[PDB]
Design an enzyme around this catalytic site. Sequence first.
Site, mmCIF file in Angstrom:
data_model
loop_
_atom_site.group_PDB
_atom_site.id
_atom_site.type_symbol
_atom_site.label_atom_id
_atom_site.label_comp_id
_atom_site.label_asym_id
_atom_site.label_seq_id
_atom_site.Cartn_x
_atom_site.Cartn_y
_atom_site.Cartn_z
ATOM 1 N N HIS A 6 -46.589 -96.909 -1.604
ATOM 2 C CA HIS A 6 -45.059 -97.174 0.050
ATOM 3 C C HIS A 6 -44.923 -98.792 0.239
ATOM 4 O O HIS A 6 -43.169 -98.881 0.453
ATOM 5 C CB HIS A 6 -46.181 -96.829 1.638
ATOM 6 C CG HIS A 6 -45.240 -97.517 2.222
ATOM 7 N ND1 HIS A 6 -43.953 -96.638 3.032
ATOM 8 C CD2 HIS A 6 -45.432 -98.239 4.086
ATOM 9 C CE1 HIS A 6 -43.892 -97.043 4.071
ATOM 10 N NE2 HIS A 6 -44.791 -97.566 4.125
ATOM 11 N N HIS B 160 -51.353 -105.945 12.464
ATOM 12 C CA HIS B 160 -51.232 -105.870 10.956
ATOM 13 C C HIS B 160 -50.553 -106.767 10.469
ATOM 14 O O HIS B 160 -49.612 -107.371 9.528
ATOM 15 C CB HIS B 160 -51.050 -104.594 10.457
ATOM 16 C CG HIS B 160 -49.323 -103.727 10.318
ATOM 17 N ND1 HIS B 160 -50.120 -102.603 11.994
ATOM 18 C CD2 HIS B 160 -48.594 -103.485 10.650
ATOM 19 C CE1 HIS B 160 -48.513 -101.968 12.073
ATOM 20 N NE2 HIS B 160 -47.626 -102.676 10.938
ATOM 21 N N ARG C 179 -27.328 -90.964 3.318
ATOM 22 C CA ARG C 179 -26.350 -90.456 4.940
ATOM 23 C C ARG C 179 -26.484 -91.701 5.281
ATOM 24 O O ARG C 179 -24.993 -92.094 5.842
ATOM 25 C CB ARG C 179 -26.572 -89.086 4.996
ATOM 26 C CG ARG C 179 -25.287 -88.583 6.231
ATOM 27 C CD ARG C 179 -25.600 -87.560 6.213
ATOM 28 N NE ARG C 179 -24.526 -87.404 7.747
ATOM 29 C CZ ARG C 179 -23.223 -86.897 7.461
ATOM 30 N NH1 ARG C 179 -22.967 -86.894 5.796
ATOM 31 N NH2 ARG C 179 -22.018 -87.453 8.159
ATOM 32 N N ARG D 50 -40.286 -88.361 13.484
ATOM 33 C CA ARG D 50 -41.231 -89.040 13.693
ATOM 34 C C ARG D 50 -42.000 -88.304 14.432
ATOM 35 O O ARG D 50 -43.471 -88.913 14.362
ATOM 36 C CB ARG D 50 -40.599 -90.879 14.060
ATOM 37 C CG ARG D 50 -42.184 -91.820 14.713
ATOM 38 C CD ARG D 50 -41.266 -92.598 14.094
ATOM 39 N NE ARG D 50 -42.543 -93.946 14.582
ATOM 40 C CZ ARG D 50 -42.448 -94.747 16.298
ATOM 41 N NH1 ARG D 50 -42.250 -92.655 17.314
ATOM 42 N NH2 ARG D 50 -43.609 -94.725 16.408
ATOM 43 N N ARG E 31 -47.686 -83.262 13.937
ATOM 44 C CA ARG E 31 -48.471 -82.611 13.199
ATOM 45 C C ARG E 31 -49.334 -82.658 12.043
ATOM 46 O O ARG E 31 -50.753 -82.649 12.144
ATOM 47 C CB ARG E 31 -47.767 -82.139 11.877
ATOM 48 C CG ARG E 31 -46.324 -81.131 12.563
ATOM 49 C CD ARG E 31 -45.278 -80.445 11.914
ATOM 50 N NE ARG E 31 -44.366 -80.080 11.605
ATOM 51 C CZ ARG E 31 -43.031 -79.700 11.131
ATOM 52 N NH1 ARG E 31 -43.500 -79.295 9.875
ATOM 53 N NH2 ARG E 31 -42.612 -79.168 12.322
#
Lengths: 481, 481, 466, 481
Positions: free
Chosen positions: B55, B121, B215, B248, B254
């Site tokens: 990431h 963090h 885009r 988001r 989910r």
Amino acid sequence: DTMKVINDPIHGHIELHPLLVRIIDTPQFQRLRYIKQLGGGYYVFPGASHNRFEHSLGVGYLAGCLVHALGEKQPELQISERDVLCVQIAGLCRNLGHGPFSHMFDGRFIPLARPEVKWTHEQGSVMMFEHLINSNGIKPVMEQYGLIPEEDICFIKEQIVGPLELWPYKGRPENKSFLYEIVSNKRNGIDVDKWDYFARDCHHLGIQNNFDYKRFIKFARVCEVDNELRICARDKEVGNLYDMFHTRNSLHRRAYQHKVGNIIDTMITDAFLKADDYIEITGAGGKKYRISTAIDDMEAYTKLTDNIFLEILYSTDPKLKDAREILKQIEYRNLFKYVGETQPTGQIKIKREDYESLPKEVASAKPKVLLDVKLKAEDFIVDVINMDYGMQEKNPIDHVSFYCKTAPNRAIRITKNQVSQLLPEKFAEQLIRVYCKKVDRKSLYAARQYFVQWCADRNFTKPQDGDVIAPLITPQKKEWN
Amino acid sequence: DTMKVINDPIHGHIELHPLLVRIIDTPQFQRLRYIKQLGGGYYVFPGASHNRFEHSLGVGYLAGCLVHALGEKQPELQISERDVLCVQIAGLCRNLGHGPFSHMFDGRFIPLARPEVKWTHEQGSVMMFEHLINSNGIKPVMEQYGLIPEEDICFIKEQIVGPLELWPYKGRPENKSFLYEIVSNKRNGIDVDKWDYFARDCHHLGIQNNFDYKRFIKFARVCEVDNELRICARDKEVGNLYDMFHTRNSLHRRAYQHKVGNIIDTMITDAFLKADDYIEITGAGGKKYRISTAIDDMEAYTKLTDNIFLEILYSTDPKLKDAREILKQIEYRNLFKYVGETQPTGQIKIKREDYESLPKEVASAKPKVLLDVKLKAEDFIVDVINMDYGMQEKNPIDHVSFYCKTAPNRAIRITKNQVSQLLPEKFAEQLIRVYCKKVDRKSLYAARQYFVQWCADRNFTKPQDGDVIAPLITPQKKEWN
Amino acid sequence: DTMKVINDPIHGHIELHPLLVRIIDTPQFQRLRYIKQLGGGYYVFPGASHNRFEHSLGVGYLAGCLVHALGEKQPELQISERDVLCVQIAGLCRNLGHGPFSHMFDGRFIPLARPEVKWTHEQGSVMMFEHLINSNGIKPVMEQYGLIPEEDICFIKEQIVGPLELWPYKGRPENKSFLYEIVSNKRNGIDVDKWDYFARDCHHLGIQNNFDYKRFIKFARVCEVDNELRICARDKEVGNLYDMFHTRNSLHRRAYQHKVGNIIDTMITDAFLKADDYIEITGAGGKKYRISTAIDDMEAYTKLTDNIFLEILYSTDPKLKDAREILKQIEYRNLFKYVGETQPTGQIKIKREDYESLPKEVASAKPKVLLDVKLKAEDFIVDVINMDYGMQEKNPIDHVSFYCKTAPNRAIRITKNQVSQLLPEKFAEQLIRVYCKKVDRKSLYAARQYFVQWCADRNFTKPQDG
Amino acid sequence: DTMKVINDPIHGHIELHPLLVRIIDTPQFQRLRYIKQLGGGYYVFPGASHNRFEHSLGVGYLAGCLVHALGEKQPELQISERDVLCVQIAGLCRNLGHGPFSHMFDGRFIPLARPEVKWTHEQGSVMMFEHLINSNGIKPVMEQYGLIPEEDICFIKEQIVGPLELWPYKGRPENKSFLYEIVSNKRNGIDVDKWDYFARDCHHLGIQNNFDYKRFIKFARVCEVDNELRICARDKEVGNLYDMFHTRNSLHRRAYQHKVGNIIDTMITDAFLKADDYIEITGAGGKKYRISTAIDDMEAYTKLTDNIFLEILYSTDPKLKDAREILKQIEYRNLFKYVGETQPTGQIKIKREDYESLPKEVASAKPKVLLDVKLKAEDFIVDVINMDYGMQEKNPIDHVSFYCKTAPNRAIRITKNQVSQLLPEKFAEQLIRVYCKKVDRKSLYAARQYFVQWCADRNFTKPQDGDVIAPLITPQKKEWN
Ligand SMILES: Cc1nc(N)c2ncn([C@@H]3O[C@H](COP(=O)(O)OP(=O)(O)OP(=O)(O)O)[C@@H](O)[C@@H]3F)c2n1
Ligand SMILES: Cc1nc(N)c2ncn([C@@H]3O[C@H](COP(=O)(O)OP(=O)(O)OP(=O)(O)O)[C@@H](O)[C@@H]3F)c2n1
Ligand SMILES: Cc1nc(N)c2ncn([C@@H]3O[C@H](COP(=O)(O)OP(=O)(O)OP(=O)(O)O)[C@@H](O)[C@@H]3F)c2n1
Ligand SMILES: Cc1nc(N)c2ncn([C@@H]3O[C@H](COP(=O)(O)OP(=O)(O)OP(=O)(O)O)[C@@H](O)[C@@H]3F)c2n1
Ligand code: NA
Ligand code: NA
Ligand code: NA
Ligand code: NA
Ligand code: NA
Ligand code: NA
Ligand code: NA
Ligand code: NA
Ligand code: NA
Ligand code: NA
Ligand code: NA
């Protein structure tokens, strides 16, 4: 006549029962190879070359997937092989009635060419299916595979168009009610037709699909709700269903109602209207039809596809010059110019019969700005778009039933407030786009001032770009600041 | 030291400048290979094996894409190669401060283990970056490549954590304000970090990403807004930005707030707390730290990763028996049981300081039902989830500036009502989940009655399955039927 | 006229310079919306609805990506904005010459309709480009953007078709040699045109693409090889290049030479031949052309697209009945019937000039078997398929130059044995398929006997399925 | 339990029978969450974070897909639900025996640490399966679901490892022979295990998969071949099968045998060997094992995962210093340097017993070149890689049978020349990579001269970069031209 396997880029290797192959291999079905799914959208999204044919195969596929999954999980529903074939045939055949450039035809051209007639692609699909069956000797093939044509033809048509006239259907009894929720779901819109186009349009457009239909299938069950057997979802999937409708609206916003795609459909429609007096299509018994009247004779309609655009474009007949010239200007990208977009505020909902008065209204606005050119009604196009969740003002999720893990056969309701406070408060709106047929810079400047003035006069929303396009008009409206 | 190419499944073939490679090839950076992006989420979504390392590479990549694009379209911004490198470094390094199981550590464990400290963090990332630079001799390498370490280290840290505290930043002047909106955008949350995790999490979870960051980059420009140079979007991209935030929120619903993933993070946190007195992590000068104190010594924190879970699981020390047993029960899937979910109505919000009082509240509810077992506070877990658009109750799109095609240097604002009536009416809500540590059938029945009674007492929303789980409790509340 | 952004499902959001937009927004370019990339392949792979238009946009895009990457890594090449635009234009325009159903037209129809003429889609693309430029006033627009039409038109055409006939090119000097290896690479076939069609055809067919073009671009460099500046690959990428060609051959095997797609292209060609005296296409000065003669007037050719199939299918004129009936039989899936397949042995290859003699040969075979029906030449189709790595019998990787990480300006060669002993030993083969236009059971039986006898007479491989 | 649904990024929503869930939810199965599929490959391809756990789920899934499809199309095979479960269990469990970093463990570490033992992951999987079943009370659960443990455990083990000692199998009779071709196909290698890893590795690596397993399933049948029932393919699929093996070889070339991934596996192996006397793993009855002896006690092996790397890396024990230092150098990317690659010419493999003589041979080469620094045997690593189609020199497609659609009960053979002249002439080869442990520029120069001289001396192929790395050595060999 064994089964055929067909490789589809969306669904992969899909099986077609031999009865389905017999239906597909006809002029009436093959016609769908020549009708773009998204019409004028291809002229904005060059990946959107896909036709109604391959979409139809996917819909028949998915209709079979859902009915098979329901039968496998709930043998008690008594879903028969005959039922499965009938559902697959309706899925396959529910796009047979589309005309040139798909929604351009039924949405824009027929309403303008034949304002007295009430035509839908659904009715077209019923008539074309009947023509396909009768012209190709399909009934004895249905029989060979265990169908009963009288009842099953009726069942297939009812899946496509709804009741052909207390349980209102004749093709199946109430104990198979859920079967009518697969192909075209008139109760809440949750059907396999949407699942195929979401995936297929996304694949071709280059926009990514966020709805997972396979998950839906896995979680779908049939339950009794108010004395009728309905397809129900797992309770916890309700957010996914709200998101299904959000996906549909986003595809409309991004793609299907693209402002340039719409103006191109408008120009093509204008060309077809100018050509309609001169193009001839031969139908049954040698009778001659027009683009606008081919819908009255399925033999003529069989030959009415996107080819009409190229017949016009390639014509040399002087009578077709004006139609041909519109199409030529599309090729040169000399399009009517987009002026702007607004929405009505409140419960205000502009009706189809008022559409023709709108360009006049825009041209009658009196912007307090210095303008050289003056524009007339005929210089403006006003396109009114209805955006909703498929049930006009209603929330379709209020028309879904759910089940819980502790009682899988027991249907419950779930209200919007039990789900999230971040969901829409409203389920229908209108977008109003204005365009100008005069494309020079002074005319466009002027058109922008008339437009923003008209918005202010009608108490429509402030255009998004309104301070930039009409800086001297936006300050007058205190509701806008 | 030339340019290295790395193949990433999300971004493809990515180029890494040699200074970036030097930063990556350190124990402080490589540590991120041992920290799962989604923590306990792997135990629900078996594709979610991905770590913070890959990431970080992607965020560094996308940070470079955005700053390069801006520079290429607007040479007048005077974006230098030095600026590009500093932005790429901040993008690469903004995940350095994450701890074991990512959000489990800063979201659940540190607040409970060190309730007096205020750890994020982001602060961790600043401390670890400083440790990385000083331990690996990076400053003379920054210099070799044209960076000025004093100003540029400050600039990098400020991109990560915000002003290190009238223009409040010291690393760059106001004429480069827009540079602070790339890596971690504190104005509206539109940053490249989200763009990488949307795509990467979706890839691993098996959920499809609907946001198009490329885009966005194409349409992004820098404009003066209230005397400051900000990144602005094209006006017509506003719907896509509302959709970015919807995306988001859907990923949280989910995946990230999956009810089982959350209970697993809860159990692991409980095991770490029970282990905290006994596990030793050696830091600078041979000093020993605990899981909860490793945050105070970057040399110890460098060695604090997801490994801690396995060190506990594989331990034989009798003092670690209680911690080890919790982890063992996770492996057998003997989890605390989900009882249900509800929401407060309106703007009503449970605060972090009240979290510990909640299990007592649930246990104090007085269901009017015959109950065999009685449950105490310590039998309940109450997990409060804040779902929002990243700015608490605010609409982040009110904090975006846009430009129009007719005036690309002129920033405007766009209000929600100018866009669509189908958008959210609110931008924040809370979910409350309740679980029971006693998992037998009588205890779960009882837990459900306490829970639904508490919901009814507090006027929270009806549980979705409330009629099924608590049929004798739901009739009391007429709003629920 | 600013830049336009276009969303393509393969490449994403692609930027088009305003000169490119001007070229695209013409009848000559827009025509490509009406020509299927894979022709008859759509009738086998229902996702293969894509047209030459979107492929051309992608080739123009990738041409720009490669020339930009080279320029960015090697400023010493002095690649100019003018060079970049000319390369993008050639990439955009190298599909202009395709006819109805793409390879059906140049591969099957023109050879039969006009056996005296020597037509290629490449030559067609040059003629259509010239027509596009001259009909749309593009030259003064090239000038406005700093192009020099005399030199640059020449350069663009040469990228499409090769030398228009020592350094053989006139549009650019040898110091820009590498620019000719981007759009249509006549040295080894490694070009951006293949890269777009691999990705795009795979996307539409439902077969997955193996080849990573973006990796290739990342590792590409320009080096001097035998006094000329050429695009070279990193040495380590040689396996990936062998795999690029394997990918191409697999796409031909699975899709482009699918036996049903081929017979459909053959039927359509047959319908066009039967229709050719009756379909009229108006060209320059109101002159009328046929399907077979539209190639002689670019104004008529502009209007010659896949539409011709529907004009035939929807016709009512009795003169078009036989053509129309063939297309009708396609719709009913009443296809000419596959009889069998064979291969020549060794490096033996049937040549294009012999193709027309082959059905007569099959019909003249004298099988010593009891045969009810007798068949004529015109009842047989004999389809000869060349499967190769794009340079006939040659290994194209022998025509690639590589560089090593320790000396990136030094071009080397890599032989097949230095790579892998699992690679092909040969780089070309020929497949011969036979079909019969008479589809009853007795005719098909007979056709099979003539076929197997012909194979035995020609010393071809024994057909399978004895 | 009922049926659980799991979302996998490769296969989507997969159903797990409750017996499978019981097997999965054990320490012996969950262990596979902590073992990377591609080992050291993650240190080259950062997307390759995926573990043996999720691969095992996919293999069990696909094993069920294939056995279900065969049973549906050919009811005459008498495939029972019991058979389906047993096949799924073998698919699920065939990766249980893998050790830390997967093939590093059985391919590099065990051969060096325990040269006397003959260990395979397959044998490990049998031993671990037995341990899983006995430690978790699975037998009464098998029985509950209709399995017969004596016969069915035997059947499952035999699917994993082959005959446990004329029809050689005891778990099923000859009339179910085809069932042994699903999970691990010892006849030709066409099994569902390859299908899952092709798709999953590609997804994570960022390389695209060109094999279509769903097509294969659609065209697969069971046919009698030489008195045995075998899974056969449609004739038309032959090209696709050659291409399946080509795909496998390309994945090995691009990824699994990446020269840097291999050197990283080599360094990790070296670290484990240096740690092996000092790391302790507690097994049955509190007995202590080493990394190299945990394979002798499944209770200890259960706790032997990739964690061992971090236990070493994070250690403070002075006895682990040398092991720890190797791992530290991996983190700094101070790797042994790649010198080059060659292949033997002609037909006979270099054998495992000669591997140890190779570094000496390279160091003994006498390049006729001025060299200041001199290298010894122990400065060289020589890695010999066997690349083949899974049956040593044999063409696996010679061991597949095919059928034609008009005679689907007649199995035939199809030869290479009946398919294409463009196919491989050979099916097995060796690659030899050389690396140098001294990394300075003079040492690397020298290493390159020794290497290219050694290639010339042994008549190996010319290194691809030979004219650049060793311009004074390549002219001597006229075979190199
Ligand atoms: C992914 C893939 N790979 C192939 N190798 C491949 N070969 C054909 N297809 C595609 O399968 C579909 C079925 O074609 P296929 O060639 O399997 O069947 P056919 O009907 O031509 O032969 P037969 O079984 O009657 O003898 C079609 O959509 C397309 F040809 C393939 N798709
Ligand atoms: C898609 C793909 N295809 C390949 N053939 C392929 N070979 C390596 N990779 C991947 O590229 C990245 C660069 O590996 P590459 O092998 O190009 O770099 P290297 O550092 O080993 O070689 P050198 O330039 O120092 O001699 C890495 O993430 C992974 F190895 C590949 N990815
Ligand atoms: C992925 C994606 N998402 C969208 N929201 C979206 N909206 C338009 N497109 C697509 O981008 C391309 C550019 O459309 P766009 O709408 O940006 O261009 P336009 O010419 O209509 O607007 P203007 O700048 O002239 O005002 C086109 O291929 C297609 F419309 C989108 N594609
Ligand atoms: C694509 C997608 N979308 C979702 N909305 C979604 N929710 C869960 N998943 C994923 O499905 C899998 C099953 O999750 P699910 O939440 O259905 O199972 P559960 O065991 O938590 O619920 P219950 O039936 O026991 O009440 C899991 O891998 C992951 F949570 C989702 N995947
Ligand atoms: Na669902
Ligand atoms: Na959702
Ligand atoms: Na910031
Ligand atoms: Na560990
Ligand atoms: Na010229
Ligand atoms: Na060229
Ligand atoms: Na002309
Ligand atoms: Na047409
Ligand atoms: Na790749
Ligand atoms: Na196959
Ligand atoms: Na193939």
